[PDB]
Amino acid sequence: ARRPARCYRYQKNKPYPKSRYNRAVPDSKIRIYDLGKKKATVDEFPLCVHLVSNELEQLSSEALEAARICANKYMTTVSGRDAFHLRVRVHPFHVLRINKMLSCAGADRLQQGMRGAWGKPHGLAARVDIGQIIFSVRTKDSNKDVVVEGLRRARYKFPGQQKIILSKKWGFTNLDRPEYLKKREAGEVKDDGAFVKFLSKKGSLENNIREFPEYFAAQA
Amino acid sequence: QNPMRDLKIEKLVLNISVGESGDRLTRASKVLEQLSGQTPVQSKARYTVRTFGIRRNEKIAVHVTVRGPKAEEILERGLKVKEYQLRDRNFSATGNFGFGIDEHIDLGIKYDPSIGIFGMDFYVVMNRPGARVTRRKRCKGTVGNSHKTTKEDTVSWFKQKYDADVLDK
Amino acid sequence: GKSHGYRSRTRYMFQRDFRKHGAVHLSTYLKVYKVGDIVDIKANGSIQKGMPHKFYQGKTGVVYNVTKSSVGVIINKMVGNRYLEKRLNLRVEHIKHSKCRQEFLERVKANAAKRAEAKAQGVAVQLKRQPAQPRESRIVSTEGNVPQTLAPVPYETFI
Amino acid sequence: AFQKDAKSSAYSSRFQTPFRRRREGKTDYYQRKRLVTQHKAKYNTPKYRLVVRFTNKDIICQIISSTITGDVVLAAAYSHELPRYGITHGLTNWAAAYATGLLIARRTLQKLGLDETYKGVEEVEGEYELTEAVEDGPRPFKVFLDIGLQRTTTGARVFGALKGASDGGLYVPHSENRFPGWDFETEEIDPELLRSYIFGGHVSQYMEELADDDEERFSELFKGYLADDIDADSLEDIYTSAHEAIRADPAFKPTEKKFTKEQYAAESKKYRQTKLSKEERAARVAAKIAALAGQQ
RNA sequence: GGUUGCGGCCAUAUCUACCAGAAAGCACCGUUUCCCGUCCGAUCAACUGUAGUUAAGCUGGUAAGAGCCUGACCGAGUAGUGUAGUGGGUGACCAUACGCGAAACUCAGGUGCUGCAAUCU
RNA sequence: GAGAACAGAAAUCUCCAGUAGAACAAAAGGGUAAAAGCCCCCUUGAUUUUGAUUUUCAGUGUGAAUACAAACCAUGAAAGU
RNA sequence: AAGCUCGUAUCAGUUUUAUGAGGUAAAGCGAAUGAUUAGAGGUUCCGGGGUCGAAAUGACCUUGACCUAUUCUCAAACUUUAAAUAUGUAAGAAGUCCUUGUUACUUAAUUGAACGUGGACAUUUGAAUGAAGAGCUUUUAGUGGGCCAUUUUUGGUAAGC
């Protein structure tokens, strides 16, 4: 009954997702990926810590859901719901298999050794490289200890080594802190829902000036 | 600027979607035939529905295309059924229009029980000269947005002649 | 259970060059193929007749015959411990000349002209090719280009 | 004027454009492959096509072979050069087409060296006969009809110009079931009627029929004939003498060039716009940002 | 230099939207006796260049346009990879030596060239 | 998508856009747009003669397939197929 | 094993130069196909539900589908792109140049195609290195249970599988 994760920790087999070929898989245990204060402008949460894998392994949907619950619960206990945006930047798409060789007694009910040992789906898992980000949070700069603690507490519920790295770059995004600041000064930014849109110097001036009047407007 | 940007009827398409074949269909064909002077053409159902009793290739309906002074003739005697009154719609986005009639006798044809009563759909389809560009074999171009027919121009034409209004929206 | 047909394992091979589908261009047919000409083989999936087997894709052979719509190409094929002479009746859509021997014949003409020029002016052309030789001594001047000193950089994350 | 179609960036990216003559709507590459490609065991022998095209106001009959850098014209005859042989009205009709085919045939054979033999039919009676070969001598110049996109039909002018070429001396393999005078039931030709079509009997019959049925149409149409003193009884003699002079001298005397290439190029480049410069694009951008930012 | 016919390479040529075009050519355009074809002379067929217009097609230009093309110590000598070690690491995997070496991203520029023939203030 | 009596989410007609998002007997894959798809006309080259060639391969057989020759036919204006 | 024909002939488990073929690794999906998280702005007479309402493609509200631009993340049986390694061909004497014969094939044509006569270019003759000789034949033995390691890789929780 859900044999251990040491049996599926390592990227041994090629990726094997839900397809027209492989169908009839079980659902994921993690289904929510964005939680906390998701309907929040980029200007509200200037911080970010990432939980980064340091091992080439593969994680379970179960572990992801567990870590999610633990981290959200700590964040909500201390800081509150309106204080963080936890995003899970990895998705369990690789299907795991079982041969399911019976468990009472193989004398007459033989189960046929390894004849026809191709297995059926067992669950879902994410294939995680080194340096691959897990669990972005984006709080304000004054909730740093709390977010570090929450991600470090989630960290117990995965295998392998994970590092908690601080970021510049307003970490939903790219674009380091002073550069985001200077663009927001120049008026190169729009608040679309939960992530911004940036000015380009490429499109028609029609669209650019209806969408970004503050940029070259000489009033401020 | 109106040298050749003059809006004229490409054609008029007369349709009767009789729902079956046999006597009703051939009689409807006779109606169209002596209304148009032109041998009409019978269309078949393109699939099966089973609520209506139509299925593939069953010789379902009749239509015919008319052009020129006979087209605008048939059009005016058929528009007098609607009393020179259409809606804001009935006019396509592209610059065409149409209207339906019942009791076709209103266009000058006796009852004549050897024919019977049928309704009709009339569709007026319009153009400005230079439409050969889109139909000819060699060098089949498009029509520019200046010279494309439009709903507004078509309505303005249909108003400024025919003594016709757009009552009921 | 296995499948080993003629066009097995040919999916991406006889794909058709993204945004180069259909309407074969006619220089293909206007190109002339004489006996002895070297030709590369590169099938076209749009022309199903006169095709090569997938072995002969990207193989380069010599013409032995010329027909109405096709040419006959000779290939040397490894079968065990030997090569065997294989003859392919292939249409010209699957066929192109060889810029290799084209360039070789250019070099032939140049070697003849050079040997003539030398027989007139000065002997000992040295008309063979030689590999890239080691480069000679020189002097590298500052005069505005002072050496810029680089140091290894410390570790940073920037994530 | 319309937007909801909205060719997306992906669509425009993975759109494959047709060949340019196809986009222009001027060429069938199916037919071109079937027609230009030579038996590869001949190795160099051009396959010559008689390209017969009909614009309005002109017929264009050309003898063309094909090459990689581009097709090459051996000879080319037009209708608008018929007025030096004696046709000045209806120079895009079936008879002018016959005469243009006659002329390309005779002009080609002249410059090619095969005019003393293969002199062609000078007793034109519409009798279907190809150009049989002359023993103790060369073979005739074989050349294949290129129509293009105009429909193969019985009574047409590509076929008139072909019949003219074949009569003029060229070998042009063809059947007789698209010349006018061919009966859908009985598989035979009416060469007397065909001779009439060659010599304008249908045009002359229409002139007579109008002139004794409706006179205003006859006044607006055919007024070139009224003004040139021509009537519908000597159109045969006109085309007869035109054929005779075409056979006399087909050698293509051209025009005199009247303010030559450089003068033409000057008067064109005057009104042909210069494109723009990059600094000028930048400047117009600067102006738009300044106007649509500062607003005076 | 334009235009026509026939093309070659087949987007620097395609698409959206506006603006221009003298000459010639192309084009729309006019009529239905005859060949011919349609439910319909719309398409096709034929006859007039006559009655009319560049309105469209066409060509060219425009656009901090979309797309496409070229280049770049732009990313990046990164990813990946051939070869090597009684190398590190519980392993997963990693570094190092002799070598080869991308794509996206970013920036900059560009937006058909050309052959044969014929014609054009 | 927008329009037209009964007509409705779907019945027939008209225009627009539509790089294939369809179809091509039957798996899957490739290929195909004045097409290899749909419709129409004509047809039997799904014929004869026996040879060379490609795959499987021993470089045998069978199966299939390719390109010609000598004939005879169909098709179409014809090139050509 | 027997040899045979020759004695630099031609060769090569190698590089270089030129020219090709490939669709793996990588990468990519604000590019197609499939999968997929999040909200944001539009949108119907042509979604549902409630409100002001005797009805009005009459006025309002929530949510779902759609569209538009963004957005996190993927593919052994997806892909625009696209390596490294491995791979085909060539690197000249059976060659290049000039003139010119045969033909029943081909051509509109003594034009082409093929094979050639005759003449011209030779020892840095058309890259590198090596060549414990090159080429050819006959006959026959044993074998036709395999295993291990590095690297790529399938199945399997794994296995000295």
Residue numbers in the entry:
A (entry chain o): 1 to 220
B (entry chain h): 6 to 174
C (entry chain u): 2 to 160
D (entry chain t): 2 to 297
Task: Give sentences copied directly from the paper behind this entry.
Macrolide antibiotics bind in the nascent peptide exit tunnel of the bacterial ribosome and prevent polymerization of specific amino acid sequences, selectively inhibiting translation of a subset of proteins. All macrolide antibiotics, from the prototype of this class, erythromycin (ERY), to those of later generations, e.g., telithromycin (TEL) or solithromycin (SOL)12, bind in the NPET of the bacterial ribosome, close to the peptidyl transferase center (PTC). They establish interactions with several rRNA residues, including the adenosine at position 2058 of the 23S rRNA (Escherichia coli numbering) which, while conserved in bacteria, is replaced with guanine in eukaryotes (G2400 in the yeast Saccharomyces cerevisiae 25S rRNA), and is thought to be the key determinant of the bacterial selectivity of macrolide action. We show that engineered yeast cytoplasmic ribosomes with the G2400A mutation are capable of binding macrolides, which contain an extended side chain and that the binding mode of such compounds in the NPET is analogous to that on the bacterial ribosome. In this study, we demonstrated that binding of macrolide antibiotics in the NPET of a mutant yeast 80S ribosome inhibits protein synthesis in a context-specific manner.
To understand the precise binding mode of the extended macrolides in the yeast ribosome, we determined the cryo-EM structure of the mutant G2400A ribosome in complex with TEL with an average resolution of 3.1 Å. The resolution was further improved with focused refinement on the large 60S subunit, leading to a final reconstruction of the yeast 60S-TEL complex with an average resolution of 2.9 Å and extending to 2.5 Å within the core of the particle. The density for TEL observed within the NPET of the 60S subunit was well-resolved, enabling an unambiguous placement of the 14-membered macrolactone ring, C5-desosamine sugar and the C10–C11 alkyl–aryl side chain. TEL binds within the NPET of the yeast large ribosomal subunit with desosamine sugar extending towards the PTC and placed adjacent to 25S rRNA nucleotides A2400 (2058) and A2401 (2059), consistent with the DMS protection experiments. The alkyl–aryl side chain of TEL is stretched in the opposite direction with its aromatic moiety stacked upon the base pair formed by A884 (752) and U2978 (2609), similar to that observed for TEL binding to E. coli, T. thermophilus and B. subtilis ribosomes, and distinct from its placement in the ribosomes of the bacterium Deinococcus radiodurans (Berisio, 2003 #4141;Schlunzen, 2003 #3935) and the archaeon Haloarcula marismortui (Tu, 2005 #4874).
